[PDB]
Design a protein around this ligand. Sequence first.
Ligand SMILES: CCCCCCCCCCCCO[C@@H]1O[C@H](CO)[C@@H](O[C@H]2O[C@H](CO)[C@@H](O)[C@H](O)[C@H]2O)[C@H](O)[C@H]1O
Ligand SMILES: CCCCCCCCCCCCO[C@@H]1O[C@H](CO)[C@@H](O[C@H]2O[C@H](CO)[C@@H](O)[C@H](O)[C@H]2O)[C@H](O)[C@H]1O
Ligand SMILES: CCCCCCCCCCCCO[C@@H]1O[C@H](CO)[C@@H](O[C@H]2O[C@H](CO)[C@@H](O)[C@H](O)[C@H]2O)[C@H](O)[C@H]1O
Ligand SMILES: CCCCCCCCCCCCO[C@@H]1O[C@H](CO)[C@@H](O[C@H]2O[C@H](CO)[C@@H](O)[C@H](O)[C@H]2O)[C@H](O)[C@H]1O
Ligand SMILES: CCCCCCCCCCCCO[C@@H]1O[C@H](CO)[C@@H](O[C@H]2O[C@H](CO)[C@@H](O)[C@H](O)[C@H]2O)[C@H](O)[C@H]1O
Ligand SMILES: CCCCCCCCCCCCO[C@@H]1O[C@H](CO)[C@@H](O[C@H]2O[C@H](CO)[C@@H](O)[C@H](O)[C@H]2O)[C@H](O)[C@H]1O
Lengths: 86, 171, 127, 155, 172, 102, 606
Amino acid sequence: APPLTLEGIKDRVLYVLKLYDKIDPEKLSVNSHFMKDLGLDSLDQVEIIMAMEDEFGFEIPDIDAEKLMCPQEIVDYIADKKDVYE
Amino acid sequence: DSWDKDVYPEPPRRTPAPSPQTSLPNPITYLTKAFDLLVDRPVTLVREFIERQHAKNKYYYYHREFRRVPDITECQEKDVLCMFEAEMQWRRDYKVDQEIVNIIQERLKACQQREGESHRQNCAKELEQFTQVVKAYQDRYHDLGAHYSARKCLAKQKQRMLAERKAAKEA
Amino acid sequence: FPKYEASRLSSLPTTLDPAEYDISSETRKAQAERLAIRSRLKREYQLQYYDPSRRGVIEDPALVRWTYARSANIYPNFRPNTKTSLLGALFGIGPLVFWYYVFKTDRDRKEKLIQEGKLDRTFNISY
Amino acid sequence: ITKDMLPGPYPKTPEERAAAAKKYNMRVEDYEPYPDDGTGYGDYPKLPDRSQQERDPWYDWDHPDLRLNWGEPMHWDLDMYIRNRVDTSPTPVNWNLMCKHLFGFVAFMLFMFWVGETYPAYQPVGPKQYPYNNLYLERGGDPNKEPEPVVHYEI
Amino acid sequence: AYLTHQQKVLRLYKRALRHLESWCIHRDKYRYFACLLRARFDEHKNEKDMVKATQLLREAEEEFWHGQHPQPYIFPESPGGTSYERYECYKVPEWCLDDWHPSEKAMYPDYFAKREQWKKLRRESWEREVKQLQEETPVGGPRTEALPPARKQGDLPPLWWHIVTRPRERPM
Amino acid sequence: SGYTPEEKLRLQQLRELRRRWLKDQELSPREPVLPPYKTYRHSIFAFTHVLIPVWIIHYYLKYHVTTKPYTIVEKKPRIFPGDTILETGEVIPPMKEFPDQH
Amino acid sequence: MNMFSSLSLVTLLLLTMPIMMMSFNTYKPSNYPLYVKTAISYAFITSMIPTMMFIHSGQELIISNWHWLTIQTLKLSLSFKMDYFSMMFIPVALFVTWSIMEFSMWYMYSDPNINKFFKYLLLFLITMLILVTANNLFQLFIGWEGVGIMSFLLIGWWYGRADANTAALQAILYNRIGDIGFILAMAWFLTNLNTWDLQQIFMLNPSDSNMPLIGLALAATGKSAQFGLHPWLPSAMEGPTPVSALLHSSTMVVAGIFLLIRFYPLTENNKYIQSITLCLGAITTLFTAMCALTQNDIKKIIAFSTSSQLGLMMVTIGINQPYLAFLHICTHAFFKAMLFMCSGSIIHSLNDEQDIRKMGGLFKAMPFTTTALIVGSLALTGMPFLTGFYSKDLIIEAANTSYTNAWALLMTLIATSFTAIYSTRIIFFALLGQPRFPTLVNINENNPLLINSIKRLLIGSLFAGYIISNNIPPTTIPQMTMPYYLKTTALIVTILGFILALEISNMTKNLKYHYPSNAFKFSTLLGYFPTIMHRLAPYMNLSMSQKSASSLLDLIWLEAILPKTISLAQMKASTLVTNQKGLIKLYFLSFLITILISMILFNFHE
Ligand SMILES: CCCCCCCCCCCCO[C@@H]1O[C@H](CO)[C@@H](O[C@H]2O[C@H](CO)[C@@H](O)[C@H](O)[C@H]2O)[C@H](O)[C@H]1O
Ligand SMILES: CCCCCCCCCCCCO[C@@H]1O[C@H](CO)[C@@H](O[C@H]2O[C@H](CO)[C@@H](O)[C@H](O)[C@H]2O)[C@H](O)[C@H]1O
Ligand SMILES: CCCCCCCCCCCCO[C@@H]1O[C@H](CO)[C@@H](O[C@H]2O[C@H](CO)[C@@H](O)[C@H](O)[C@H]2O)[C@H](O)[C@H]1O
Ligand SMILES: CCCCCCCCCCCCO[C@@H]1O[C@H](CO)[C@@H](O[C@H]2O[C@H](CO)[C@@H](O)[C@H](O)[C@H]2O)[C@H](O)[C@H]1O
Ligand SMILES: CCCCCCCCCCCCO[C@@H]1O[C@H](CO)[C@@H](O[C@H]2O[C@H](CO)[C@@H](O)[C@H](O)[C@H]2O)[C@H](O)[C@H]1O
Ligand SMILES: CCCCCCCCCCCCO[C@@H]1O[C@H](CO)[C@@H](O[C@H]2O[C@H](CO)[C@@H](O)[C@H](O)[C@H]2O)[C@H](O)[C@H]1O
């Protein structure tokens, strides 16, 4: 399987969020808090995590998932699990 | 040849001559010729070399002959010196009889393979001979136990002889 | 929705347990101390697990107690009474007596057939 | 280790129950010893008879394969509940209902097989006929005895 | 349960969607039914009565048990998946390298030179890491498994070795 | 629900250490420092894995196994009506005439 | 006989040389997998020469080359029976193993222990050939348990995985339970016939052969995973896909059927055994196919297909058609190994994904894997003139024109329809519809090793059945006259299954949600047999081991009634003897008592 990179993981994390109708793709950034900045709720955040699992083909446990609150946090979580260091 | 054809009999061989009914070449014919050329010839010469060295050093070994001694019937009770010889002789005969049953079993199994689908009718002599020898072996040695001896064998025979006598008396 | 009939080998899901819900400050206090005990043991383990100069095994008293419980400690706490004796009588003596009659009856039946000549042993010369 | 930290006899007072629970790293409330039937458990804690498969996969265990933490009391039957052995995790079908359906299917299959053995299926055909007194010699019949002839006719 | 009410609802939502996905299979059909399922959660989103909210959770869990897929989808490397623990046989602890024969170490002069710096870095930091845990831990031991960060420059977060040096998820 | 400030800082610090450890796992160009046609390859394979073994096996079978009784037992050849026996020259009679119904 | 006997032994000696070179460190560790693959290719060639000789004139022989041990009147020799069943199976097994090994070279490329993997695959095959050519029951038993142990080591290949260790041990458990019957058969044959050699058993032809054959049926039940001992084969899916291909097509699971085939001279005369095996196979073929209808793991579907096909072979045994059962063993080997290899191609391209719900849209993305998958499926469902039609179709027509249990015939037919249904499932979900896999597409089936290994088995799945049926000699009277509806029963129930399966598959697309039926759950959870039995039996036996065997008896009662009671009595008596006052008055007063009782009671003074 082709290796992952920090830039590659970030691109796909943002890519998925730009296909979510509840986010504004222009206002989105790696550091956008899903509630404070993007104004989503927690039911929406579960769906975002669910979509990240489907994007990368592995599961984030609910204990870990509820803390990933901005795109950069997801990118960091995936990189740590997959041993991505660039 | 190598063994005795009387002890291990083989019925005469009957091989049908080839009757090719096809224009095609037979693969087995040429592979056979290749096998003789590539395998049989080199293997044959290597053996003939070894058979030359053996012929230059010919020496012999013998099959031991065991004189017959008095059996356990002729031994006085608790006379170990006579019992020992009769006991050892009986043990030697026990091993030989075991190999007799093996020979008859080997004939039976060779016949079953040789005759193929016809073995049921063409191995009746072998089966009959096997059935009789197994009856004789069973009568001599069966049920003696791990600690068998010439004495236990004799006691088993006497018991059998007694039963046959009594039935004969009923006749 | 037919309810959940839990068994020994098919436990009850926590999601269907009333005990999980309807929480009280008394229970929450209990979960607090359980977690505190866990963290005290985790800390004591981590301090030895992460020690650079430690080469060896971190002896676990919980494991020593388990193995010691399931061998050396049984007899001191044993009592000969109705439960232990009835179980001892059933599972120690009982199976032997059962198997005795099974084999003795079978061997006796076969022995009679051999004497009367009614058991076939035409080719039986290996024993 | 030391005798004070090893398992002991059945606890007989609220205070002996407190020292036992302390010894096994438990709360005096959560510690409950096996009944004192004289079977030899002693003061060893009786723990919820649950398989190790039931424990949280995602928690960071000291022994991830056993799903145990260093120092926590081990179930008396821990070796029977490892993930390789007895699993007690909840089933999507109740235990008893599972038994009824599996038993019912098997029992029904066996009954129908007997019914099919009493009423065998066959074609409307007479017995297959063989020559030479039903191949008497081939099957192994005695050459010396003269078999009862078996005659087959056309139709 | 140490999970708050919010955690239970969010966990049930995720678990219900995944089992719904197993039933539907097809992505368009799943999208249609996931939205109806979300609508049901949105219906009681503002229920301010805890007693009713808890009661709604109980029935929801009861309904999920009846409707759960008997063979749900599992990510291959997730607990219970077909690749769970598939690579544990290849993960070898780093302390196994201290036992290598010198002729084995001579083949990787650069790797074992770096490894020595890490081992040197581990010895130097240990004393301060034990000290930091001593000063921050209340009498009566810790109450949670959370660990502190480093508070100064040149300090490493206490108890870091076995997290930093753990085997790669795809070692060999 | 997110990370606490204390947690985020610890995750940050472990991450830099881990990524540095993973970076150090890479091999340098000179590592490892080791110490000091088809027909032909299939021809050498056939020689050493077929011809030499079949030489040994034929020698074994011909001059050791077959010199003992009943070590190799062949099913006797099938004889069909009209066959001729090589050993003797005996000719097996044909079967009697059929009704020739077709 | 010189060429025939020489060549059939080099075949076996050839396969062991890579084992010998390996364990003797004389090899070239560079490309050992290619060396092992090359040896298997050459052994296929050498095994074709004896097979052609048998095809020509029916030449068969027995080779007893080494006398190992004589036990009084039982001589045990290393013997090899090169007969009908050995000469056809050996080239087929080697041909399929040739493809699997080439396929494994690509599938296992990244495995660090690939050299050990190929060594185990070679031992797996060697023990199968010992099983197939064994001429006596002891030599056969060596192969019998060899494949079981090799199966254990390969199923549990990823030994850090608890689930793989449970599956590997479970396979031993179920196969050892079967081995009770094998030992029983050996004991009966030695006692009653004084032999283990197949020749003497058949010549003596026992009439009261109920006990030995029940033992053989029990052994076949475990090895071929018939109902009662079946769960281990689906669980054996833990192993790498190449293991599943070889485990299911050749080597292990077929040995059970082969054992019963080898003993057809006995079974053909015992109607009671025929009735039992027929029912045993019928429930097996029906139940396992019923379980495949709802499985979502692609390997578990094919695993349940094998159990269903093995049940069919057991049915063929039950109707006194040993040679058709053998033919199905041979034809089944081709397309079943291909199906497993095709699924491996899909699993690899989808980053280790095995759930069909997460595939789809692969019909065009993986064209060559798709062609092989369709050919394999059609061969499995008895499509006319594909390899699977020449065995399966004859079996069905012999089944419904025989004197048979009516229920077993009806079960067998329904399972034939189920075969089309679960075959439709794999194609519909893996290949058709829209893709359901993750976004990073890495589909790639362009490795020549993958293409060639499947290509060879694809040709076999098209012509191997035709070639074999036209070359094997006839050993029965094939039944060819029958009513039109009995002739076409196999074809029509297959077509009906395809039609119905298609309708069921299409309903998944509709925007409807349905609660599961008890029947649906029953199929999915494998009749609850693994759920109930793999918790109840382990629990009861393991709990009795600790509670009663150890504690109650060994740590308590066996101690109490002897050492602990005796030592306590001695301690008590010691205290009575030694607890004295040291008083002169008391000791001498006891002397007076001793003297008095000496005269009055015991009359020691007389
Ligand atoms: C510790 C495990 C406890 C399990 C229970 C075991 C009970 C064991 C009982 C020992 C056997 C007692 O029974 C024993 O049977 C044998 C037959 O073989 C008898 O043997 C004798 O009697 C038989 C007929 O009865 C005659 O052939 C002959 O006189 C002699 O063989 C013994 O006279 C008798 O004492
Ligand atoms: C193609 C397949 C060909 C072979 C088909 C074989 C059919 C086998 C059918 C076996 C049925 C056995 O299962 C049987 O089902 C009914 C229906 O739930 C069960 O019934 C049980 O569940 C419910 C309770 O909620 C009620 O029906 C009843 O109170 C209870 O007994 C029986 O307890 C069970 O014994
Ligand atoms: C009782 C035994 C009787 C026969 C004994 C004959 C001994 C002959 C030994 C020949 C070498 C065997 O050992 C091994 O053989 C193979 C092919 O020959 C060689 O392997 C070579 O060819 C194979 C395939 O062509 C390649 O996979 C491999 O990359 C290459 O090195 C090994 O380098 C050698 O170590
Ligand atoms: C021995 C080998 C036997 C091989 C038998 C092979 C299959 C035999 C044909 C089975 C039926 C063919 O398929 C028949 O026609 C069309 C397919 O275009 C189906 O039509 C279906 O196609 C679309 C697919 O998107 C569905 O969404 C729609 O519900 C339906 O109209 C019919 O529902 C079916 O009855
Ligand atoms: C089976 C038929 C023949 C059996 C003959 C056996 C005779 C007895 C041999 C062992 C004698 C040992 O004598 C003594 O036994 C007791 C327990 O049994 C041991 O003592 C141990 O067990 C006892 C009671 O279980 C405890 O009170 C004690 O605290 C403990 O140390 C002694 O350390 C040992 O010295
Ligand atoms: C078939 C005949 C077999 C004869 C075997 C030879 C017998 C030898 C007998 C030695 C007896 C002395 O052994 C003695 O047993 C008692 C067990 O009650 C032990 O006593 C132990 O158990 C008792 C009570 O269980 C405790 O009160 C005591 O504190 C403890 O030490 C002694 O420590 C030991 O010294």
